[PDB]
Amino acid sequence: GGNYNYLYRLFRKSNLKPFERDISTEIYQAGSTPCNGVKGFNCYFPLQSYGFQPTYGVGYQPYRVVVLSFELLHAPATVCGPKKSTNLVKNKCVNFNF
Amino acid sequence: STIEEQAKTFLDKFNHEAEDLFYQSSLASWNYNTNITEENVQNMNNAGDKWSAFLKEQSTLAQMYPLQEIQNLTVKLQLQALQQNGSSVLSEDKSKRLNTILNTMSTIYSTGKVCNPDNPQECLLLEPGLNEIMANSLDYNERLWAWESWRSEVGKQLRPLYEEYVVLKNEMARANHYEDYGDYWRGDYEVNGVDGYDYSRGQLIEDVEHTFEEIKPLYEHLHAYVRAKLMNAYPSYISPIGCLPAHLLGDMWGRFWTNLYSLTVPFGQKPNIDVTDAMVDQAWDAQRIFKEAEKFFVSVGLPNMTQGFWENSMLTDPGNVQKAVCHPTAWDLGKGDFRILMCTKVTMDDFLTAHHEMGHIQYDMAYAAQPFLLRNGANEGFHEAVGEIMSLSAATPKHLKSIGLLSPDFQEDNETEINFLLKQALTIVGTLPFTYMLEKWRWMVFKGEIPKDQWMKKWWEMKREIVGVVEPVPHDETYCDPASLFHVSNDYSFIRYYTRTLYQFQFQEALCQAAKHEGPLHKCDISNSTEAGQKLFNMLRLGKSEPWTLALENVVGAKNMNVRPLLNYFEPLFTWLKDQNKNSFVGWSTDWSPYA
């Protein structure tokens, strides 16, 4: 029937800084007439609701995205990938990395 | 505040809701046209009224914009399209009277019933039956009686309605800043944007008749051949100097002469090409037909048809109580939804119908990137022309043999080519004079140049001159012969099919030129020609975002509306008729009638 739980901003005075989020619901002012919190002659609601459906074609369907950003501040680092190990051998002159 | 920026914001806000509302309405219409059921009527009521209430109040808001300072041509054109006020410019009583007369005209025209006088308890309709008896019969009294009954029991009571319908239509045409409704119908064939390609509504008035006189000798030779065939088939019924009655053409409107092909076959010894037996023996189902036809689009160069289409779209076998309409249509529901609605069967007619429908589907994909309001053709004569050009190109015996459908050892000659050319000409070029005269009639009746009394006389006296159709029985002023036609009680412009055919021929000639093909223009093959596909795709994607004058610049060499390819397509037919009607005078005389 249409997934309307998804909304996206369409009208804003300016752009977004890197890693910036704004949840302000102020009615946009396309013109110069002030609006007292309601749309009207030159005011529109800045957020638009998606109508996602399984019947939607390719490119119009909902898509789930996750972005990983890595920070390496001079504080001690703890997020590191796994490091495997071999098997020990005895009675053999070998070079080791314990 | 600024106008253009807020105009763009309002346009985007409008389109955001227009997209999904049109998507919902189209989806509901598709669902019912696939699932015909009683519970799917109230939902269209609640969807259509909502669509109307969305298409007017937003257009009502499209009046605060002073569309005189907008610099962008696209924004200005889109706002002008939204700036239309519709027919609500009059008072409520006049508008409701117009709606009432339109609805009652449609209902009465949809109740055509004529009874045979011997048994007045058996009335037939426009459906097969009366129409079938008229089309396929060998007699004069029955067909003439059917014609008279249809144009008298349907062509009389609609006349008083038409009397004030015309004046009301012209009246809100005046209220819509148009001198006549003819210019309202000619508003589409106009561009007032970029310089050097300017077109006007009044230009099309004189742009219609001057492109037909070059085809007049061919039509005269075809009419002479038809008259000779009627003489050797219907003795003592057609004047050799004059012409044939209205009903003997094959259709009551004289639109098409397909029913007359068997009587006027050039070479009836050799049957026409039909590979329905190929499907029957090879067991080519609907999916096989569609895929083998899609190979043509793949070879052309157009993008491959979208996945999931076979799932959503119905194709064959309505079967049980689950009924679907058997009218082949291409549905563009929006939001990336495209579907086909046809009752696919084992028939080469169904083959060409599926070809045309998938051509419409590809055209639907063409304007996918266009905004909501620019997802339409530049003019009405492009969709059908695009659909039919490939159908004409995919009907050649070479095209049939290329897919392995036909043996490589045929012995085709000029006889079958001439037969096919005349069979196709009986419908393609045989409708141009009727279209021209009908369009002139509608333009002059909506222009008001002729009074009420000068309707039947002028219509008949120009029909005899142009088409060569005389009255089988006399008529009086109260009769309205054109009223018994589909696009006369429906308020639909008929000039689409006039420029549409010339677009077909011009684009086919251009493709044959830029497709590495030589010889006659009626045997061109455009398959496996990637370069030819780009020429069409350059304009198909544009839609209405660019002028039609610019549209006739990326496919055809010249933007002018010149009838170049019609005289060359039926060139073998013309040179064969040169050796056919030697002893018969070409033309007709407007002094002989079947009754007297």
UniProtKB/Swiss-Prot annotation, chain A:
Changing residue 45 to S: In strain: Lambda/C.37, Omicron/BQ.1.1, Omicron/XBB.1.5, Omicron/EG.5.1. Changing residue 7 to R: In strain: Delta/B.1.617.2, Epsilon/B.1.427/B.1.429, Kappa/B.1.617.1, Lambda/C.37, 19B/501Y, Omicron/BA.4, Omicron/BA.5, Omicron/BQ.1.1; Contributes to cellular immunity evasion and increases infectivity. Changing residue 15 to K: In strain: Omicron/BA.2.75, Omicron/BQ.1.1, Omicron/XBB.1.5, Omicron/EG.5.1. Changing residue 41 to V: In strain: Omicron/BA.4, Omicron/BA.5, Omicron/BQ.1.1. Changing residue 51 to S: In strain: Omicron/BA.1. Changing residue 60 to H: In strain: Omicron/BA.1, Omicron/BA.2, Omicron/BA.2.12.1, Omicron/BA.2.75, Omicron/BA.4, Omicron/BA.5, Omicron/BQ.1.1, Omicron/XBB.1.5, Omicron/EG.5.1. Changing residue 48 to N: Reduced host ACE2-binding affinity in vitro. Residues 1-63 are annotated as: Receptor-binding motif. Residues 10-45, 74-96 are annotated as: Disordered. Changing residue 1 to S: In strain: Omicron/BA.1, Omicron/BA.2.75, Omicron/XBB.1.5, Omicron/EG.5.1. Changing residue 8 to F: In strain: B.1.1.298. Changing residue 33 to K: In strain: Delta/B.1.617.2, Omicron/BA.1, Omicron/BA.2, Omicron/BA.2.12.1, Omicron/BA.2.75, Omicron/BA.4, Omicron/BA.5, Omicron/BQ.1.1, Omicron/XBB.1.5, Omicron/EG.5.1. Changing residue 7 to R: Increased resistance to neutralizing antibodies. Decreases HLA binding to NF9 epitope. Increased binding affinity to human ACE2. Changing residue 74 to P: Increased resistance to human covalescent sera neutralization. Changing residue 48 to R: In strain: Omicron/BA.1, Omicron/BA.2, Omicron/BA.2.12.1. Changing residue 30 to V: Increased resistance to neutralizing antibodies. Residues 3-11 are annotated as: Immunodominant HLA epitope recognized by the CD8+. Disulfide bonds join 35-43. Binds to host ACE2. RBD also interacts with the N-linked glycan on 'Asn-90' of ACE2. Cleavage of S generates a polybasic C-terminal sequence on S1 that binds to host Neuropilin-1 (NRP1) and Neuropilin-2 (NRP2) receptors. Interacts with host integrin alpha-5/beta-1 (ITGA5:ITGB1) and with ACE2 in complex with integrin alpha-5/beta-1 (ITGA5:ITGB1). May interact via cytoplasmic c-terminus with M protein. May interact (via N-terminus) with host bilirubin and biliverdin, thereby preventing antibody binding to the SARS-CoV-2 spike NTD via an allosteric mechanism. Attaches the virion to the cell membrane by interacting with host receptor, initiating the infection. The major receptor is host ACE2. When S2/S2' has been cleaved, binding to the receptor triggers direct fusion at the cell membrane. When S2/S2' has not been cleaved, binding to the receptor results in internalization of the virus by endocytosis using host TFRC and GRM2 and leading to fusion of the virion membrane with the host endosomal membrane. Alternatively, may use NRP1/NRP2 and integrin as entry receptors. This is Spike protein S1. The lineage of its organism: Viruses, Riboviria, Orthornavirae, Pisuviricota, Pisoniviricetes. The gene is S.
UniProtKB/Swiss-Prot annotation, chain B:
One of its GO terms (molecular function) is carboxypeptidase activity. Disulfide bonds join 115-123, 326-343, 512-524. Changing residue 61 to T: Increases slightly the interaction with RBD domain of SARS-CoV-2 spike protein. Changing residue 375 to A: Slightly inhibits interaction with SARS-CoV spike glycoprotein. It is found in: Cell membrane; Cytoplasm; Cell projection, Cilium; Apical cell membrane. The active site is at 357 (proton acceptor), 487 (proton donor). Zn(2+) binds at residues 356, 360, 384. Its main location: membrane. Residues 1-589 form the Peptidase M2 domain. Changing residue 13 to Y: Increases slightly the interaction with RBD domain of SARS-CoV-2 spike protein. Glycans are attached at residues 35, 72, 85, 304, 414, 528. N-glycosylation on Asn-72 may limit SARS infectivity. One of its GO terms (biological process) is negative regulation of ERK1 and ERK2 cascade. Keywords: Carboxypeptidase, Cell membrane, Cell projection, Chloride, Cytoplasm, Disulfide bond, Glycoprotein, Host cell receptor for virus entry, Host-virus interaction, Hydrolase, Isopeptide bond, Membrane, Metal-binding, Metalloprotease, Phosphoprotein, Protease, Receptor, Secreted, Signal, Transmembrane, Transmembrane helix, Ubl conjugation, Zinc. Changing residue 496 to Q: About 50% loss of angiotensin I cleavage but two-fold greater activity with angiotensin II. Changing residue 371 to A: Slightly inhibits interaction with SARS-CoV spike glycoprotein. Changing residue 306 to P: Increases slightly the interaction with RBD domain of SARS-CoV-2 spike protein. Optimum pH is 6.5 in the presence of 1 M NaCl. Active from pH 6 to 9. Its EC number is 3.4.17.23, 3.4.17.-. Belongs to the peptidase M2 family. Homodimer. Interacts with the catalytically active form of TMPRSS2. Interacts with SLC6A19; this interaction is essential for expression and function of SLC6A19 in intestine. Interacts with ITGA5:ITGB1. Interacts (via PDZ-binding motif) with NHERF1 (via PDZ domains); the interaction may enhance ACE2 membrane residence. (Microbial infection) Interacts with SARS coronavirus/SARS-CoV spike protein. Essential counter-regulatory carboxypeptidase of the renin-angiotensin hormone system that is a critical regulator of blood volume, systemic vascular resistance, and thus cardiovascular homeostasis. Converts angiotensin I to angiotensin 1-9, a nine-amino acid peptide with anti-hypertrophic effects in cardiomyocytes, and angiotensin II to angiotensin 1-7, which then acts as a beneficial vasodilator and anti-proliferation agent, counterbalancing the actions of the vasoconstrictor angiotensin II. This is Angiotensin-converting enzyme 2. The gene is ACE2. The chain holds residues 19 to 614 of 805 of the full protein.
